[PDB]
Scaffold this active site. Structure first.
Site, PDB file in Angstrom:
ATOM      1  N   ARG A  30       4.140  -2.837   7.331  1.00  0.00           N
ATOM      2  CA  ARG A  30       4.855  -1.619   7.718  1.00  0.00           C
ATOM      3  C   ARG A  30       5.367  -1.665   9.152  1.00  0.00           C
ATOM      4  O   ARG A  30       5.555  -0.603   9.778  1.00  0.00           O
ATOM      5  CB  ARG A  30       4.021  -0.332   7.475  1.00  0.00           C
ATOM      6  N   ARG A  34       7.660   4.619   9.856  1.00  0.00           N
ATOM      7  CA  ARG A  34       7.842   5.918  10.486  1.00  0.00           C
ATOM      8  C   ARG A  34       7.229   6.064  11.863  1.00  0.00           C
ATOM      9  O   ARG A  34       7.529   7.041  12.567  1.00  0.00           O
ATOM     10  CB  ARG A  34       7.306   7.015   9.555  1.00  0.00           C
ATOM     11  N   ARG A  43      16.636   6.434   8.730  1.00  0.00           N
ATOM     12  CA  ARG A  43      16.294   7.068   7.459  1.00  0.00           C
ATOM     13  C   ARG A  43      17.106   8.347   7.269  1.00  0.00           C
ATOM     14  O   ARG A  43      17.583   8.641   6.154  1.00  0.00           O
ATOM     15  CB  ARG A  43      14.789   7.394   7.399  1.00  0.00           C
ATOM     16  N   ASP A  80      10.962  -1.908  -1.492  1.00  0.00           N
ATOM     17  CA  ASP A  80       9.778  -1.296  -2.082  1.00  0.00           C
ATOM     18  C   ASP A  80       9.336  -2.104  -3.285  1.00  0.00           C
ATOM     19  O   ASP A  80      10.157  -2.751  -3.933  1.00  0.00           O
ATOM     20  CB  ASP A  80      10.055   0.135  -2.515  1.00  0.00           C
ATOM     21  N   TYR A 158       1.586   1.974 -11.176  1.00  0.00           N
ATOM     22  CA  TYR A 158       2.618   2.990 -10.995  1.00  0.00           C
ATOM     23  C   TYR A 158       3.379   3.281 -12.288  1.00  0.00           C
ATOM     24  O   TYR A 158       3.733   4.433 -12.564  1.00  0.00           O
ATOM     25  CB  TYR A 158       3.573   2.567  -9.871  1.00  0.00           C
TER      26      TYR A 158
END
Ligand code: NA
Length: 357
Positions: A30, A34, A43, A80, A158
């Site tokens: 990461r 953010r 973003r 992703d 998922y």
């Protein structure tokens, strides 16, 4: 004459191959994220997380952001893990949700390996664009590029859950209740993951990483049957060389410290570790068969700089003066992390490991 463009910094690739280096290379899960105000600005321009991932100019922009701040030893493709099930037609949206969760025999029957070129061209276009962006005015590459995928099991989590979860109890219960259907999902996922990673390699990924983030939710036995065997199936089908160089393969099961020997026997070049694992003991356990990546607790990056640097020294000292370590966290950088704490970590890992090595 040379096999590929000049790579100015290749310490990351060399460590994954257990080669002599001057210092221990570092990249961070990461590293595009953010915690960087510029990531959030980008973003906002894109309109959403999926907007960033699905447009190669945005993906490239955020991939390069941490490299402008910190002298990290690798870039990682911004994407992703859920691109694959999206390409399978499950309808991803943004945590994540699928319009079509995989629940019945008929749902499973509809699963097929996607034509990677036709459905996931945006990912290979990002890989191509990032390689061009990492090239300076003289044609040399700054740092290597990492491609990646979720593991077959982690994708299955998922896919069956129909989105994100805190425990994935619904998918695990399906593995026990309908193991045949579960295996069918895993079989298709493994073929898709190999095709996807190979496409990324052909486009210019120089190492590949398999994120088995949810493998550690599984019981012993179940882990091997529903996750590990499928990691092995993927690795068996991966391109191991490209552009005249070995393409190292990395697997990381978070919570998978008990299965290190098993993971190290899958054919991967390197195994990722979380912070609960003693890094020196792990090195002994694999006996130099594979490189190790990790394993700092990301929560340490909230502590003062002196504490951060001391903990970085402790990780390195645990591994000792031996080849085959890539420094990383045991999970992703928190969105609340001060960027200067990342700068301090990278600096200490470089300086202390040079002193060791
Ligand atoms: Na080096």
């Amino acid at each position: 004459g040379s096999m590929a463009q000049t790579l100015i910094n290749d310490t990351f690739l060399r460590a994954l191959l257990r080669e002599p280096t001057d210092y221990t290379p570092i990249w961070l899960m990461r590293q595009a994220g953010r915690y960087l105000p510029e990531y959030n600005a980008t973003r906002a321009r894109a309109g959403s997380f999926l907007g960033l991932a699905k447009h190669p100019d945005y993906a490239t922009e955020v991939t390069l952001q941490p490299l402008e701040r910190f002298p990290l030893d690798a870039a990682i493709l911004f994407s992703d893990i859920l691109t694959i099930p999206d390409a399978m037609g499950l309808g991803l949206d943004f945590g994540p949700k699928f319009a079509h969760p995989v629940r019945t025999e008929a749902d499973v029957a509809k699963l097929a390996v996607p034509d990677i070129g036709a459905t996931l061209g945006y990912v290979t276009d990002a890989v191509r664009e990032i390689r061009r962006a990492l090239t300076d005015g003289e044609g040399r590459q700054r740092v290597p590029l990492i491609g990646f995928s979720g593991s077959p099991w982690t994708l299955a989590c998922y896919m069956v859950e129909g989105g994100g979860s805190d425990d994935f109890r619904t998918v695990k219960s399906m593995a026990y209740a309908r193991p045949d259907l579960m295996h069918r999902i895993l079989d298709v996922n493994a073929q898709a993951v190999a095709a996807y990673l190979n496409a990324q390699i052909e486009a210019g990924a120089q190492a590949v990483m398999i994120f088995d983030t949810w493998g550690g939710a599984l019981a012993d036995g179940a882990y091997q049957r529903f996750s590990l065997d499928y990691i092995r199936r993927v690795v068996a089908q991966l391109k191991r060389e490209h552009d005249g160089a070995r393409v190292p393969a990395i697997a990381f099961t978070k919570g998978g410290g008990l299965w290190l020997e098993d993971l190290a026997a899958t054919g991967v070049d390197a195994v990722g570790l979380d912070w609960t694992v003693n890094l020196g003991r792990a090195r002994e356990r694999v006996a130099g068969r594979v490189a190790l990546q990790g394993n700092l607790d990301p929560t340490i990056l909230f502590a003062p700089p002196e504490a951060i640097r001391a903990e970085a020294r402790a990780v390195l000292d645990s591994y000792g003066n031996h080849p085959g370590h890539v420094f990383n966290l045991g999970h992703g950088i928190s969105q609340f992390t001060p960027p200067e704490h990342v700068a301090e970590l990278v600096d200490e890992v470089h300086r202390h490991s040079r002193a060791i090595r």
